[PDB]
């Protein structure tokens, strides 16, 4: 039952909520909720680039085009860090990923992907989360 209390959406929510409070308090950033579909970061990026998540298909399409035009290089390495690098280069802006952690200063990006050159453009910042979801476990037998 310790397992269960620990995985309760209650404790997970409290952590995610604390993480929101921290980001705001330490960096002044605000996590904005995107619509829930897939492991896709296209909605989050669209909000970062266009101020509108419903532009996700535009972002996805350019990303796919940019990957494909750069196949040989990207071939060396779904595969979200590949998408993230592509999008940093294509928008020429750094992409920063944030995530809850109990390590020191969770409020620092867990990783930063760089565009082509440095400039004064605001970085693209996204939030990595893993949301509780239940499926149905069927027994045909």
DSSP string, 57-124: HHHHHHHHHHHHHTHHHHTT---HHHHHHHHHHHTTS-EEEEE--SSS-TTS-SEEE--SS--SSPPE
State how far the Cα of 133 lies from the Cα of 135, in Å rounded to an integer.
7
Q: Is 63 a catalytic residue?
A: no
Report how many domains make up the chain. 2
3-state SS class at 42: helix
Find where tokens 């996204």 sit.
126
DSSP per position, 113-128: E--SS--SSPPEEEEE
Q: Domain check: are 106 and 141 in the same one? A: yes
Beta strand 95-99 with 111-113 is antiparallel
- Selected catalytic residue, list 72, 78, 117, 133: 133
Backbone angles phi, psi at 66, to 5 degrees: -65, -35
**Residue 129: Cβ within 10 Å count:** 15
User: What is the CATH classification number for the domain harbouring 107?
Assistant: 3.30.200.90
Q: Domain check: are 51 and 23 in the same one? A: no
Q: Domain check: are 32 and 65 in the same one? A: no
* Residue 134: domain span: 1-36+94-141
User: What is the CATH classification number for the domain harbouring 72?
Assistant: 6.10.20.180
Q: Is 72 a catalytic residue?
A: no
Q: Domain check: are 62 and 45 in the same one? A: yes
Resolution (A): 2.2
Q: Domain check: are 42 and 85 in the same one? A: yes
- Selected catalytic residue, list 37, 72, 78, 117: 37
Q: Domain check: are 18 and 42 in the same one? A: no
DSSP assignment letter at 38: S
Q: Domain check: are 47 and 114 in the same one? A: no
- Selected catalytic residue, list 40, 62, 114, 129: 40
């Amino acid at each position: 039952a310790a397992r269960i209390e620990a995985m309760d959406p209650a404790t997970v929510e409290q952590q995610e909520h604390w993480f929101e409070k921290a980001l705001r308090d330490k960096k002044g950033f605000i996590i904005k909720q995107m619509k829930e579909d897939g492991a896709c970061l296209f909605r989050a990026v669209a909000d970062q680039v266009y101020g509108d998540q419903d532009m996700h298909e535009v972002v996805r399409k350019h990303c796919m085009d940019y990957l494909m035009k750069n196949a040989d290089y990207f071939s060396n390495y779904h595969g979200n860090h590949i998408e993230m690098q592509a999008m940093a280069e294509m928008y020429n802006r750094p992409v920063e990923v944030y995530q809850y952690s109990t390590g020191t200063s969770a409020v620092e990006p867990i990783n930063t992907f760089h565009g082509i050159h440095q400039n004064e453009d605001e970085p693209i910042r996204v939030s990595y989360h893993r949301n509780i979801h239940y499926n149905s476990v069927v027994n045909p037998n």
